[PDB]
Every structure is written in structure tokens, then in C-alpha cells.
Design a protein around this ligand. Structure first.
Ligand code: NAD
Ligand code: NAD
Lengths: 382, 385
């Protein structure tokens, strides 16, 4: 049980990268690549595009190739698959694999609409022997683990506020024109929220809990020739009375990336997703208020993860679950938290109203489908 | 006239400060004409500290006395428009304190009154407009040098105020006394500044928590989203329960970025090329990769701190100068309504849980305020029309 063979569905940008990581062919001069994880190997490659097949024949000549991912699953050349394909296919593949005893590592975001993701979760719960995971690779980052640990420990008391401005992923019209599926309601089901935002959206929920209510201002085609949102401002509320805000866009040439958490007993500020300043109050504010600088102590944490580290670490973690039951950092059921939040943001955005989180699945789907229909590029979803 | 005598209505903390500045216990064109307070203790203090300065219980008597050439409304906010309107109708120059008023209806009436008596000088104490820091940022934005604004965000949590502070004043933090908490107290100078530099929001969405970690009925934790005619967005966050509050004001523009830290220091980033230009170039991913990794932007730094009394005296002097020789006002009183409307819109959004257009319906706001006043039971309900 030394190694788990992985089949990549979609040898696109992400799929290609994964293939390189598994093969040890990942490194670019000027880019260290993480070595192949011990328990991981590349079993097979699947793509519907002939050009991709040609590339696969060239770069990976001795690696079995399949046009149809169902054929790859049945081949027994692979022990698990990774869904590096457009998001709409994620739950479709997952459900099929769970029903056919095939371990599935689903890419972010888990899916486009919460209904399909819920079905996937229920399917997995009904085939528990099958390993079911999501590629929330940022959970392998010691930075976010550090912040989660401190918050969850209750050492700094309860959260009162979170604020994350993350504007540093500039993407011009030229980038948007590169992919047909990306930035299309029918292709992606959204823009920034379904692409750049999901890892962060999961992280925010993972560290700060899941918002009870979502209010969002979503601008479609902000300084860009697309129909989907790429400038988003969100307000959230939480069971315990805390508030939150999240701001992101793809038109900022010099975007802030600053994540603040304010707590009863301290404060955390994370800059550029690398460095965290942790402030511990000598006394909780509640205590200070009751009474009627030397007052705080500051701790610093910095971590940067090298190319391939996060994805390989997930791959290895996932393999290990299959092999010896090691717990998953990213159990696939968790994928729905991020999808629900993205859906709630979009629906708030579309209706101009605050919404409870999660939103009604059918209401979201209708509004998505309406947009898909108008776009006319892709089939509506049932 | 060489000097304008000022009558202070409300020798409270602000009134006292002003009195000191003018006594030198002064700006060249400014003097203290008279003091007015309804509290006997204040009168006694005024007799002690300012024995040669005429004192009046009734501010209407002070106005008519001809001991003063202008008045300053250092009294609870509900009186601001009442005094202003009276003074405009009686040819008396009036410098209205922040916020201009509690509810927009009364402030609008004040503005219309002033517009009907234009010979009377009408001003507001937006003393932060005298701060070279905010002047610098306004100038750059308004010049169009950095192109249009796309986003503003101001987190300002550094005015920690515990329950003990709230207990100090009966009028403060009461719907009937103040008409709000953080929005009517700490927030107004900032709210004006935000509007002054970034324009006035078309729409306001707000999350306002009453009695956040505090034993008060009014809001003291506020998160706001705004939209603007030109498609920009904005956010404003403030509260009085943060022991170590951020104060960071960011403006993102087509052609640069501004970040102001702790209300003292500004970092100005000027893009070599505007984003619109970069987008038009349709640069390839390698070029995009080069962008994100300092060559693209240049940084300028600006820092100013204003010493005690500078801002208030400078306004006083500016105001006097308008009366004397027509010098333009840095803070024309009509502008006071921008901040009041925004505060009202924030509150009303907060109360209804819905986005609102700015400005909101005056009667709707007043009703919701009055409902809260009635429940509080500390003060009489306020009725206009
Ligand atoms: N975990 C992460 O950090 C991360 C990073 C990037 C992308 N991803 C995820 O990977 C997915 C997209 O990969 P990408 O962004 O490289 O897209 P891409 O367009 O570069 O690659 C997709 C490939 O899938 C192929 N394809 C589409 N439908 C197929 C099908 N039914 N069978 C086989 N091949 C099919 C296409 O031919 C294409 O070659 C998305 O879910 C994205 O969110 C995750
Ligand atoms: N511009 C600034 O920097 C700044 C700073 C603080 C306060 N202020 C403003 O000053 C005003 C008062 O605030 P404060 O902190 O001085 O409060 P305060 O309660 O200390 O002072 C108000 C004073 O007015 C008196 N008063 C009430 N009704 C009166 C009446 N009818 N006639 C005469 N006196 C009357 C009270 O007895 C008291 O002495 C408010 O509008 C506040 O917004 C402005």
C-alpha cells in the first residue's frame, strides 16, 4: 500500500501542474517544485481536447491516457481521481465515483450551486468507505493553521469582527479572453467568487465560523468586458453577534491584502498572506470595561509555502487517508461551506437585499439559470 | 471690522475650550464677545474665569445685545438648526457645530433659510478641513491627477470609550438627547471628510449594533457599504469597544492609491500607467506576472499633526475673515447636510436591514427616530411639519 495512483481529469493548467508534481517534471528554472509525495503517483491522464492528448503523449508517453473519465475510472489504472475540470462537472464526477467505489479528490470550488454539492455530500455519507476530499490546499499553510489554532483555542476570547481586503490578484481583459469557460455564468457560475475567492472564502469561514447572514455588493464587468462579478464587498453577521467584511476585485493594480480579526482578548492582523501580527491584551476588553503600550504584547508569525507544497501536501494527506486512515485536513463535506457563502453573496448581490446564510437552493438556482439563459453560451442547469 | 466678537452658546467642554482659545486663557480677527449657558454652575464658572465677559442665560438675549457679531452653537445637536434659523432670520452670523443637526429635515430647512438670507455668514465647524493632511489628499483626488476613484475604505476603531465615559453626559448616547451614538459623536468629522474627499454616496447599506459591549441604547459598532454616481464603492467601519483600533483610510483610483495611517501619515502611490491604460495594452501573462512578484509605481509620503487649538481657531479665523473681507469659507454651512444625510441613511438602513438610496426620506427617518425616542422615555419626541 506504498502509493496511491491518481488519475487527473482535465490536464489543463491545474491538471498539468499536478501531473508535473507527481512525475517530478514540475520544476521550472527559476521555480523550485515540490518533490513527488511518498505515497502519491500519477496513474493516468484524461482530457477531451486532442491537443491536450498530444501534449500528454509528448510529456508523459508511458502514462495511460483516456478521453472519457468514466473509462479511466473503470480501467483500474488509478486508485483515485482529481477533478481539474470546469466546476460544473465537479459534483457530477464525484457522485459517479462514490457510487462506483472510486476515491475522489474534488477541486475548489466544490461546485457551482449548493444543491448539487449537498447531493454530493449525501452520496458520500452513503458510501463512507470511499475517500472523499476537497483541494483546500491553503489549509496546509502553517500561517492559517496558526491563526485557526489561536482563535479556536479561545485564548483570545470570542471574535467580535473580521475584515479581509484582498485586491492583489490583478487580471486584465486579456486574461479573461484566454478561457471560454472562465468568467461565464454558464461556464463558471460566477467570476471572482468562483475563481480567486473560494480558497479565501473557505479560510475565512474556517477561522471565523460560518456567517448567519450575508449582505453583498457585486459589480459585474467592473472595468472589464465580462458579465460576471469581479468587484465584491460583503458584510456578514455571526451566531455570536460578531460582524465581518470581505472585499475583493481584479482591477486593482496595487491591491491591499490585509486580514484583521478583532477579539475580546486580542487582535490579529495578517499582511500579504505571509505575515501575522498577534496582539494579546493584558486584560480582556470586557474586564477593562467592567473596571470603571504595556497593555498589549505582540507576537509575529511568518510562513510562505513554495510552489507545489500545498497541493502535494493535500495529495499526500489524501493518499494517507486511503492507505492507513490518517484524518483528512480537507474532508470533502466541508466544501459546501464555501459554496453556500459564494451563493449567498451572489444572491444578495443580485437582489440588493440582506439574506440568511445559507440561501434557498432553488431560489439561487433560478437566478443563476436566468443569467445563464440570457448569456446564451451554455445550457441551463437542472 | 478688525475683529469679530463671538458669542458662545453652551460653555460645555467644547464651549470652554473655545472661550480659552479666544481669551488666550487668539486668532487676529477673532475675540470673545459673550458667554451663554442655561446651567447656573456654568454661569458661576463664567463669572470666575471670565469676569469681564458679558454672560447671558438666554442665547436670544445675547444675540439681541449687540455684544456679539457671531455665535457658535456649542450645545447639544438638537438645538443647532433651531439657533441657526433664528440667527439667519435676525441678521446674526452663525457658526454651527458638528454635526450640523440630528435629522436632515431640520438641516435642510436651515440651509434654505440661509439661502434666503445670503448676506448672513453661515458656516460649520468642520475643523478637520484645516488639516494639511486632508487638504493634501483632497487636492490630489480633486485634481484628477490620479484619475477617478474606484474604492474607498476607512476603518477607524481607535476611539475606545468605556461605559464609564458613556455615563459622564446625560444628553450624549441617548436617542432623545443626541439622536444616535457613534454616528452623531465620534463619526461626523470623519463622515464629512469621507464625503469631502470621495464625494457623496448614491446608496448606503449599514449594519449598526446598539449597545455593542456597552450599556447604551444607541449604535456604537457600525459597518457601512456605499456606492457612488461614478460606479465606485466604499466602506466605513467604526466602534468604541476596540482597545487597539485600526485607523486606516484607503482610496483606490484609476491612476494611483492613497493610504492614510493613524490620521497623521499618508502614503501616495502613483501608477506609471493608469489601470485603464494597462488594460488597453492587453499585456500577456508574462507581462502580468512581472507586475506581481515596485517598478510599476512611485511612492510619496506626507505627514501632518495639528497642535491643540489649531483647527478650531483656524476655522474661527476663516469665518471671521469671511464676515470682514469676503474670504471664502473652508466650511460653508450648507455642506453640513452631507454628513447628516449620510448618518441618517446609515441609521435607517441599520434599523430596516435594507439598502437605501441616499438621501433617505426625511419623514421616514424622523418616524423611526421618534419611535426610538418614545421607547427611551428620557426626552420629548421631535416633530417637524
Ligand atoms: N486548488 C487550486 O489551487 C486550484 C487552482 C487552479 C484551478 N483549480 C481548479 O481546477 C479547475 C480548472 O482547471 P483549470 O482552471 O486549469 O482549467 P483549464 O481550462 O486550464 O483546464 C481544464 C481542462 O479540462 C478539460 N475538460 C473539460 N471538460 C472535460 C471532460 N468532461 N473530460 C475531460 N477533460 C475535460 C479541458 O479540455 C481542459 O483541457 C477548476 O475547478 C479550478 O477551480 C484549483
Ligand atoms: N468641533 C469639535 O471638535 C467638537 C468637539 C466636541 C464637541 N463638539 C460639539 O459641541 C456641542 C456640545 O458638545 P460638548 O462636548 O461641549 O457638550 P457639553 O454637554 O459639555 O456642553 C453643552 C453645554 O451647553 C449647555 N446648554 C444646553 N442647552 C443650552 C441652552 N439652551 N442655552 C445655553 N446653553 C445650553 C449645557 O448646559 C452645557 O453647558 C455638540 O454639537 C458637539 O457635537 C464639537
Amino acid at each position: 500500500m506504498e502509493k496511491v495512483r491518481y488519475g487527473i481529469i482535465g490536464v489543463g493548467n491545474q491538471g498539468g501542474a499536478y501531473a508535473g508534481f507527481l512525475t517530478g517534471t514540475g520544476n521550472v528554472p527559476g521555480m523550485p517544485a515540490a518533490p513527488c509525495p511518498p505515497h502519491c503517483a500519477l496513474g493516468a491522464l484524461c482530457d477531451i481536447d486532442p491537443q491536450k492528448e498530444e501534449m500528454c503523449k509528448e510529456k508523459y508517453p508511458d502514462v495511460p491516457f483516456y478521453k472519457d473519465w468514466k473509462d479511466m475510472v473503470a480501467s483500474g489504472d488509478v486508485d483515485a481521481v482529481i477533478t481539474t475540470v470546469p466546476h460544473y462537472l465537479h459534483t457530477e464526477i464525484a457522485i459517479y465515483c462514490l457510487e462506483h467505489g472510486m476515491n475522489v479528490l474534488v477541486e475548489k470550488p466544490a461546485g457551482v450551486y449548493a444543491k448539487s454539492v449537498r447531493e454530493m455530500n449525501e452520496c458520500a455519507a452513503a458510501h463512507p468507505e470511499v475517500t472523499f476530499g476537497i483541494m483546500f490546499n491553503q489549509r496546509t499553510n502553517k500561517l492559517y493553521q496558526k491563526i485557526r489554532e489561536i482563535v479556536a483555542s479561545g485564548e483570545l476570547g470570542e471574535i467580535r469582527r473580521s475584515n479581509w481586503i484582498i485586491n492583489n490578484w490583478y487580471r486584465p481583459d486579456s486574461y479573461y479572453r484566454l478561457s471560454d469557460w472562465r468568467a461565464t455564468w454558464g461556464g463558471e457560475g460566477g467570476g471572482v467568487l468562483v475563481n480567486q475567492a473560494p480558497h479565501q472564502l473557505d479560510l475565512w469561514q474556517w477561522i471565523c465560523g460560518i456567517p448567519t447572514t450575508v449582505y453583498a455588493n457585486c459589480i459585474n464587468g467592473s472595468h472589464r468586458d465580462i458579465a460576471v462579478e469581479n468587484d465584491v464587498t460583503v458584510l456578514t453577521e455571526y451566531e455570536n453577534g460578531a460582524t465581518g467584511s470581505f472585499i475583493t476585485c481584479t482591477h486593482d493594480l496595487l491591491g491591499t491584502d490585509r486580514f484583521e480579526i478583532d477579539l475580546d482578548g486580542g487582535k490579529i492582523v495578517v499582511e500579504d498572506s505571509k505575515k501575522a501580527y498577534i496582539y494579546r491584551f493584558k486584560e480582556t476588553e470586557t474586564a477593562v470595561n467592567a473596571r470603571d503600550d504595556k497593555m498589549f504584547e505582540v507576537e509575529e508569525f511568518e510562513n510562505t509555502d513554495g510552489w507545489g507544497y500545498q497541493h502535494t501536501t493535500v495529495m499526500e494527506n489524501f493518499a494517507q487517508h486511503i492507505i492507513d486512515g490518517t484524518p483528512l485536513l480537507a474532508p470533502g463535506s466541508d466544501g459546501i461551506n464555501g459554496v453556500r457563502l459564494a451563493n449567498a453573496i451572489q444572491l444578495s448581490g443580485w437582489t440588493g437585499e440582506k439574506v440568511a446564510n445559507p440561501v434557498d437552493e432553488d431560489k439561487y438556482l433560478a437566478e443563476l439559470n436566468k443569467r445563464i439563459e440570457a448569456e446564451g453560451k451554455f445550457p441551463v442547469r437542472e
